[PDB]
DNA sequence: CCTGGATAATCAGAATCCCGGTGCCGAGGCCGCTCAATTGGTCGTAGACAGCTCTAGCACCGCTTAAACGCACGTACGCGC
């Protein structure tokens, strides 16, 4: 089990005509984990700081706000908040 | 006091930046990232910022005075403070 | 408010770092860096205290922001 | 599929699994893995867009690690996020100082 | 003595890739210096993981975890 | 000035595999079995560290007016880094 | 004799395309198990935030002396050569 099929679905979504090599897929599959830890780790420490034991969507939001710089946070805060409202109103 | 003032503040341990203009600057920075509202700052939280920034500035100066003597200079320049902010990341 | 960091203050700061001849616009180079640093700590530190629905940055919110910056402050842990 | 409800391409149930079995907490909310998978999908699309543009700028139809290095190193927001990073078979930026 | 395996043309390519016009003489040994003190801090921190599990095959996972411990993460070797 | 624009556009390994493999296995016995994927993981990061250290030490070179590297260039760059 | 401009002779300045050979590679897509995400009943408890008290930050009002702004001289030193 890896992200090499779901990242490939994104690759065939934006710029679908181009491909990728097997080595770069080794990088990308690593890269998403580099995004996966530092946001979810710092959010978990956000649960440890202000006397909590629940990680809701508000924790990951300020975790992206604390980690991603500038507009890379300001556009990722509009991507997950759009997705959680679509998930709640299924 | 070239050989005198160098050996006094290093033996000393207290603050060098005044507390109240540093607190005013910290509040003027804090009102930027709070959408324009007043904000309470604890007495420990301002001294923490002061103790961090003073140590960071003396570390940046002691890491740039080694770049001063690298060019055969004894006069510190902003080229050394902008080079020390480049080999740190 | 940026001129609150006075000229012998930066002189004493560079004297603690061991600088003999402290230049001119260096005094404007320091408070600039002090504007760069103190922003980067405060942009995180109020982000921690806004999650707990609080309007006061404590010492711990400064410690967490500095631990995010890469330098661990010791003597303010409550 | 909970990712079809979120409108994503990243698996919601897998992100929730790595959030629950990954020793992060003991009570993970239902809004956390959807937000996390959306943030992952956005940033992978962001790096693949700059990788897909630099591939055609270098006249290539296949994304190489050099194209990923050109995607990372030619973006202010990506270089600030990825500070202590290195790329295998990606080289460096050509610059004369 | 395998410190001479890092040769002068290899150090020359490493310098010319870093934008160096004129390399000096000791730089062809100084590399052999720093690659003796950097890589060792990568080796032991990669073998202790090998000393943590019951194995003798030091995988690339131990290497990238050691490089994560030192503070320079590596891409292309996870899975 | 000739090959500077040659290796920056390229991506291949500058150091050969087997001398680097013997150099790594010389440190390995100081504390086994090395996969071929692990030797590349040891070599890529070390090469990219060496090129980046030379690039950051060349900024110490053009600070004094010089264009030639020096032993004080590789000892002053790692001083600010704390390594 | 001298002098304005016309043109006649000239060796010697580098790299580049191609035949002459190749040689083991590596990607996007199908079959369709299968088992881990779905759905759901059931347990199980976290802090929403509203009450409530309470140490503590804001702000002012404001005493004395340590400290900063800058002038003038002045010389050593980054840099020109």
Swiss-Prot record, chain A:
One of its GO terms (biological process) is antimicrobial humoral immune response mediated by antimicrobial peptide. The modification Phosphothreonine is found at residue 81. There is a cross-link at residue 86 (Glycyl lysine isopeptide (Lys-Gly) (interchain with G-Cter in ubiquitin)). The modification N6-malonyllysine is found at residue 82. The modification N6-lactoyllysine is found at residues 9, 51, 74, 82, 86. The modification N6-(beta-hydroxybutyryl)lysine is found at residues 51, 82, 86. The modification Phosphoserine is found at residue 2. The modification N6-(2-hydroxyisobutyryl)lysine is found at residues 9, 12, 23, 51, 74, 82, 86. The modification N6-glutaryllysine is found at residues 9, 12, 74, 82, 86. It comes from the Eukaryota. GO terms for molecular function: DNA binding; lipopolysaccharide binding; protein heterodimerization activity; structural constituent of chromatin. The modification PolyADP-ribosyl glutamic acid is found at residue 1. Its main location: nucleus. Glycans are attached at residue 78. The keyword Plastid does not apply. The modification N6-succinyllysine is found at residues 82, 86. Keywords: Acetylation, ADP-ribosylation, Antibiotic, Antimicrobial, Chromosome, DNA-binding, Glycoprotein, Hydroxylation, Isopeptide bond, Methylation, Nucleosome core, Nucleus, Phosphoprotein, Ubl conjugation. Belongs to the histone H2B family. Core component of nucleosome. Nucleosomes wrap and compact DNA into chromatin, limiting DNA accessibility to the cellular machineries which require DNA as a template. Histones thereby play a central role in transcription regulation, DNA repair, DNA replication and chromosomal stability. DNA accessibility is regulated via a complex set of post-translational modifications of histones, also called histone code, and nucleosome remodeling. Has broad antibacterial activity. May contribute to the formation of the functional antimicrobial barrier of the colonic epithelium, and to the bactericidal activity of amniotic fluid. This is Histone H2B type 1-J. It comes from Homo sapiens.
From Swiss-Prot, chain D:
Keywords: Acetylation, Chromosome, Citrullination, DNA-binding, Hydroxylation, Isopeptide bond, Methylation, Nucleosome core, Nucleus, Phosphoprotein, Ubl conjugation. The modification N6-(beta-hydroxybutyryl)lysine is found at residues 21, 80. It is found in: Nucleus; Chromosome. The modification N6-glutaryllysine is found at residue 80. It is involved in the initiation of both imprinted and random X inactivation. Ubiquitinated H2A is enriched in inactive X chromosome chromatin. Ubiquitination of H2A functions downstream of methylation of 'Lys-27' of histone H3 (H3K27me). H2AK119Ub by RNF2/RING2 can also be induced by ultraviolet and may be involved in DNA repair. Glutamine methylation at Gln-89 (H2AQ104me) by FBL is specifically dedicated to polymerase I. It is present at 35S ribosomal DNA locus and impairs binding of the FACT complex. GO terms for cellular component: CENP-A containing nucleosome; extracellular exosome; nucleosome; nucleus. The modification N6-crotonyllysine is found at residue 21. The modification N6-succinyllysine is found at residue 80. One of its GO terms (molecular function) is protein heterodimerization activity. The keyword ATP-binding does not apply. Its main location: nucleus. The modification N5-methylglutamine is found at residue 89. It comes from the Eukaryota. One of its GO terms (biological process) is protein localization to CENP-A containing chromatin. The modification N6-(2-hydroxyisobutyryl)lysine is found at residues 21, 59-60, 80. Belongs to the histone H2A family. The nucleosome is a histone octamer containing two molecules each of H2A, H2B, H3 and H4 assembled in one H3-H4 heterotetramer and two H2A-H2B heterodimers. The octamer wraps approximately 147 bp of DNA. This is Histone H2A type 1-B/E. It comes from Homo sapiens (Human). The lineage of its organism: Eukaryota, Metazoa, Chordata, Craniata, Vertebrata. The chain holds residues 17 to 113 of 130 of the full protein.
From Swiss-Prot, chain E:
Changing residue 12 to W: In TEBIVANED3; results in early developmental defects when expressed in zebrafish embryos. There is a cross-link at residue 68 (Glycyl lysine isopeptide (Lys-Gly) (interchain with G-Cter in ubiquitin)). Changing residue 22 to C: In TEBIVANED3. The modification N6-lactoyllysine is found at residues 8, 54, 68. The modification Phosphoserine is found at residue 24. The modification N6-butyryllysine is found at residues 8, 21, 54, 56, 68. Coiled coil: none annotated. The modification N6-(beta-hydroxybutyryl)lysine is found at residues 8, 54, 68. Changing residue 8 to R: Abolished ufmylation. It is found in: Nucleus; Chromosome. The modification Phosphothreonine is found at residue 57. Acetylated as part of spermatogenesis progression prior to histone-to-protamine exchange. It is linked to Tessadori-Bicknell-Van Haaften neurodevelopmental syndrome 1: An autosomal dominant disorder with onset in infancy, characterized by poor overall growth, microcephaly, hypotonia, profound global developmental delay, impaired intellectual development, poor or absent speech, and characteristic dysmorphic facial features, including hypertelorism and abnormal nose. Other variable neurologic and systemic features may also occur. Tessadori-Bicknell-Van Haaften neurodevelopmental syndrome 2: An autosomal dominant disorder characterized by poor overall growth, microcephaly, hypotonia, profound global developmental delay, impaired intellectual development, absent speech, and characteristic dysmorphic facial features, including hypertelorism, abnormal nose, and wide mouth. This is Histone H4. The lineage of its organism: Eukaryota, Metazoa, Chordata, Craniata, Vertebrata. The chain holds residues 25 to 103 of 103 of the full protein.
From Swiss-Prot, chain F:
Component of centromeric nucleosomes, where DNA is wrapped around a histone octamer core. The octamer contains two molecules each of H2A, H2B, CENPA and H4 assembled in one CENPA-H4 heterotetramer and two H2A-H2B heterodimers. CENPA modulates the DNA-binding characteristics of nucleosomes so that protruding DNA ends have higher flexibility than in nucleosomes containing conventional histone H3. Inhibits binding of histone H1 to nucleosomes, since histone H1 binds preferentially to rigid DNA linkers that protrude from nucleosomes. Transmembrane segments: none annotated. GO terms for molecular function: chromatin binding; DNA binding; protein heterodimerization activity; structural constituent of chromatin. One of its GO terms (biological process) is protein localization to CENP-A containing chromatin. Its main location: nucleus. The modification Phosphoserine is found at residue 21. It comes from Homo sapiens. The keyword rRNA-binding does not apply. It comes from the Eukaryota. GO terms for cellular component: CENP-A containing nucleosome; chromosome, centromeric region; condensed chromosome, centromeric region; cytosol; nucleoplasm; nucleosome; nucleus; pericentric heterochromatin. Ubiquitinated. Interaction with herpes virus HSV-1 ICP0 protein, leads to its degradation by the proteasome pathway. Keywords: ADP-ribosylation, Cell cycle, Cell division, Centromere, Chromosome, DNA-binding, Host-virus interaction, Methylation, Mitosis, Nucleosome core, Nucleus, Phosphoprotein, Ubl conjugation. Residues 28-64 are annotated as: CATD. The gene is CENPA. Belongs to the histone H3 family.
